[PDB]
């Protein structure tokens, strides 16, 4: 019933609104950088040269770097926004787009800083770089994109080694979902209704990450079956906690704690389910109903007439139990997530 023509109209409405309203000359930090992952997805689907130039202009403005410190003795890997936070993954997601742009038009300068930073990181003995679940989306696809360019096998071994540490802190083996960081595991932390607290956008980042890993990881990689198994298990756990309306609530298995629609988790999940079905890793008959409800929510409720995307949970605000997300809450990174879902929906329609 829905056509590719109609989906492309949506994609272009959303993307043109964002690019007309916002200049590309802004910093390479995670929120802008996630938007660029969405834009690169649109470029893959459409070949649009203006959209490509928007990402190139952003990369040029940031000098093809993330955080800019050239003093490795001061490099930090915890949260920060100043130039020494070079090893913090929110300053590394930009490298996904720099690698994508390099593949189109190779020039050593485009990946010089990415190689410098990730190769230094991998040389250190520290393993707990991905100490918050969102890091998986920020950095796992960097590993496969940099491998694709360099063929340096350490990228693919360290992908596994870092993810193993993330799992040790956050992965709940019984449930098949990730806690958002070390403060959240059960039973020491519980929801208002005594449940395990799994953050939706957190698990969205992880689930979309594994799809992106599997999209570019070589077929022969020794850990590929581990990633497929993790992706398939998460798909089942995520499906099981979808709301009747098609979205996922911010606390995935306590909808009453943080009620009502939320878009960014939903869009990341939708991307992952559509990619999984399109790529033969998730059963179409089982998961197509999940994606129909989710996409219908995204198209009907999150999408506004002018291309704005609403109901995006904001960044870094303390949880207020019982309080809904504002319909009008819209952020770059959420538009990015929406575009991933929308692009993959076109591919699902054939």
Instruction: Please spell the DSSP secondary structure of 193-247, one letter per residue.
Output: TS----BHHHHHHHHHHHHHHHHHS-TT-TTHHHHHHHHHHHHHHHHHT--TTS-
SS3 for 299?
helix
Please give the backbone phi and psi of residue 174, each rounded to the nearest 5 degrees, phi first: -70, -40
- 């906690």: which residue's tokens? 241
Q: Which residues, in sequence order, are bridge partners of residue 177?
A: 172
* 8 A C-beta contact, residue 324 and residue 25: no
Question: 142, 34, 56, 29: which is closest to 95 by C-alpha?
Answer: 142
Q: With 0-12 CB in 10 A as exposed, 13-18 as middle and 19+ as buried, what is 329? A: middle
> Residues 6 or more apart from 303 whose CB is under 8 A from it?
10, 14, 309, 310, 338
Measured from the Cβ of residue 60, the count of other Cβ atoms closer than 10 Å reads: 14
Q: Exactly one of 90, 134, 221, 254 is catalytic; name it.
A: 134
Read off the CATH number of the domain in which 86 is found: 1.50.10.10
Phi, psi angles (nearest 5°) of residue 303: -65, 125
Cα dihedral sign, 33-37-42-47:
positive
User: Closest Cα to residue 332, out of 107, 24, 7, 3?
Assistant: 24
- What is the rounded CA–CA span in Å between residue 141 and residue 235? 19
Domain limits at 213? 1-350
Kindly state the DSSP code that residue 92 receives in the 8-state scheme: T
Residue with the two structure tokens 């309306």: 245
- At 172, which helix (H) or strand (E)? strand 171-172
> Number of structural domains, the chain?
1
8 A C-beta contact, residue 130 and residue 165: yes
- 218 to each of 205, 207, 223, 235, how far by Cα in Å? 21, 19, 10, 22
Burial (CB count <10 Å: 0-12, 13-18, 19+), residue 82: exposed
Spatial distance between the Cα atoms of 89 and 118, rounded to a whole number of angstroms: 10
Active site residue 134: yes
Token readout for 194 is 């005594």
Q: Which residues of 238-269 are buried (b: 16+ CB within 10 A; e: fewer)?
A: bbebbbebbbbbbbbbbbebbbbbbbbbbbbb
Phi first, then psi: give them for residue 199, nearest 5 degrees: -75, 130
Question: Residue 23 has which token pair?
Answer: 């200049």
In degrees, rounded to 5, the angle at the alpha carbon of residue 54 between the alpha carbons of residues 25 and 87 is: 60
- DSSP H helices, the chain, are 4-21, 30-46, 49-61, 94-104, 108-123, 135-150, 154-170, 200-216, 224-240, 263-278, 284-297, 332-349
Give the tokens for residue 33.
């950088």
User: d(Cα 132, Cα 178) in Å, to the nearest integer?
Assistant: 10
């Amino acid at each position: 019933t829905e056509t590719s023509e109609e989906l492309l109209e949506i994609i272009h409405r959303v993307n043109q609104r964002y690019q007309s309203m916002h200049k590309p000359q802004v910093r390479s930090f995670w929120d802008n950088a996630v938007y660029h992952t969405g834009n690169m997805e649109v470029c893959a689907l459409t070949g649009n040269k203006d959209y490509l130039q928007y990402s190139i202009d952003w990369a040029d403005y940031n000098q093809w770097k993330g955080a800019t410190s050239n003093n490795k003795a001061e490099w930090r890997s915890t949260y920060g926004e100043s130039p020494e936070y070079v090893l913090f993954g929110d300053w590394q997601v930009c490298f996904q787009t720099y690698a994508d742009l390099y593949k189109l038009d190779p020039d050593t300068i485009k990946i010089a800083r990415a190689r410098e930073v990730m190769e230094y990181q991998m040389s250190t003995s520290k393993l707990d770089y991905w100490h918050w679940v969102d890091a998986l989306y920020m950095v796992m696809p960097v590993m496969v994109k940099m491998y694709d360019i360099t063929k340096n096998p350490l990228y693919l071994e360290k992908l596994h080694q870092y993810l193993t540490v993330t799992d040790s802190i956050m992965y709940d083996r019984e449930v098949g979902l990730y806690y958002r960081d070390a403060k959240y595991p059960y039973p020491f932390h519980k929801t208002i209704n005594g449940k395990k607290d799994f953050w939706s956008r957190g698990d969205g980042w992880a689930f979309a990450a594994f799809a992106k890993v599997l999209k570019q990881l070589p077929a022969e990689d020794k850990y590929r079956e581990e990633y497929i198994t993790r992706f398939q298990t998460m798909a089942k756990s995520i499906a099981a906690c979808q709301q009747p309306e098609g979205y996922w609530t911010r606390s995935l298995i306590d909808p009453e704690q943080a009620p009502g629609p939320e878009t960014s988790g939903t869009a990341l999940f939708t991307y992952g389910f559509l990619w999984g079905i399109n790529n033969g890793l998730l059963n179409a008959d089982i998961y197509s109903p999940i994606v129909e409800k989710a996409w219908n929510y995204l198209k009907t409720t999150a999408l506004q007439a002018d291309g704005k995307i609403g109901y995006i949970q904001p960044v870094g605000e303390k949880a207020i139990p019982g309080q809904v997300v504002d319909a009008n809450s819209c952020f770059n990174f959420g538009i990015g997530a929406f575009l991933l879902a929308a692009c993959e929906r076109v591919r699902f329609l054939q």
